[PDB]
Design a protein around this ligand. Structure first.
Ligand SMILES: *[C@@H]1O[C@H](CO)[C@@H](O)[C@H](O)[C@H]1NC(C)=O
Ligand SMILES: *[C@@H]1O[C@H](CO)[C@@H](O)[C@H](O)[C@H]1NC(C)=O
Ligand SMILES: *[C@@H]1O[C@H](CO)[C@@H](O)[C@H](O)[C@H]1NC(C)=O
Ligand SMILES: *[C@@H]1O[C@H](CO)[C@@H](O)[C@H](O)[C@H]1NC(C)=O
Length: 244
């Protein structure tokens, strides 16, 4: 959770002069949050929360200085606030909060001196999220298209397409019985960082399976370690089903 730009924004409308800026975190109607995408001057692409709500005034003489817009990231408890500062119906919009893929947010509006709604951002498999800067940093553009072939002597041959980075990969084999989810075997295979010559080429690893009847469901997972996502890159898997 962050602001796209931190300078004060002009939010003025006919009959209402308005400024909005980040503030220290201290009635609104029709609070709505849409997912939008912002392209930056630096050439990046971020998912943003497009937040809107209505201020309805009546004949009532009232002291109204502004509004506080609060966004809480539920996984980290990161909270950011912006304060609207004033001078029948006015619709307010704020689209400068950058959000993270696959995260839930709680949005709150308070008139100063309330309404709360939650917002869930789709993961990096969503076609529009896939091309954002955060998703591409998680390796969203790489498609290994992992395939696992059963070999004659209780071995598997795993094939996968490498990306274009000189970083290592790991293949994690976890074996299971047909239905029970307690593993009967586990093995990690280190794939050395490829040379630029093997970039975008399809490589393979041969895995040796545990010789145990019933230990027949083999999950094979590839984890890349691209410099932009370290231990947090998107992973892919294929599973060999039991021939039972
Ligand atoms: C990925 O694997 C599937 C296997 O059925 C195949 O249809 C598809 O064409 C493969 N993709 C590429 C890029 O070769
Ligand atoms: C990696 O491959 C993609 C293929 O679309 C390309 O856009 C990108 O520029 C390549 N990155 C590097 C560092 O060569
Ligand atoms: C066992 O693993 C499968 C994985 O697809 C899952 O659907 C199922 O709910 C799991 N069951 C238990 C008891 O963990
Ligand atoms: C498996 O991959 C290695 C490169 O990592 C290659 O030398 C070998 O020939 C490939 N094996 C098969 C069966 O294609």
């Amino acid at each position: 959770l962050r602001l796209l730009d931190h300078r004060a924004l002009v939010c003025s409308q006919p009959g209402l002069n308005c400024t909005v800026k980040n503030s220290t975190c201290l009635s609104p109607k029709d609070l709505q949050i849409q997912l939008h995408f912002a392209h930056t001057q630096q050439g990046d692409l971020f998912p943003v929360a497009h937040i809107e709500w209505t201020l309805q005034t009546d004949a009532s003489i009232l002291y109204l200085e502004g509004a506080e817009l609060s966004v809480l990231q539920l996984n980290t408890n990161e909270r950011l606030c912006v304060r609207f500062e004033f001078l029948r119906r006015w619709r307010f919009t704020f689209s400068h909060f950058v959000v993270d893929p696959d995260q839930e947010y709680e949005v709150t509006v308070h008139h100063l001196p309330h309404q709360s709604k939650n917002f869930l951002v789709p993961d990096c498999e969503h076609a529009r999220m896939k091309v954002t800067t955060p998703c591409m940093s998680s390796g969203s553009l790489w498609d290994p298209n992992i395939t696992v072939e059963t070999l004659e002597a209780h071995q598997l041959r795993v094939s996968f397409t490498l990306w274009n980075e000189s970083t290592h990969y790991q293949i994690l084999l976890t074996s299971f019985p047909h239905m029970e989810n307690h593993s009967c075997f586990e093995h990690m295979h280190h794939i050395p960082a490829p040379r630029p010559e093997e970039f975008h080429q399809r490589s393979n690893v041969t895995l040796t399976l545990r010789n145990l009847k019933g230990c027949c469901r083999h999950q094979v997972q590839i984890q890349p370690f691209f410099s932009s996502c370290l231990n947090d890159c998107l992973r892919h898997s294929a599973t060999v089903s039991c021939p039972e």
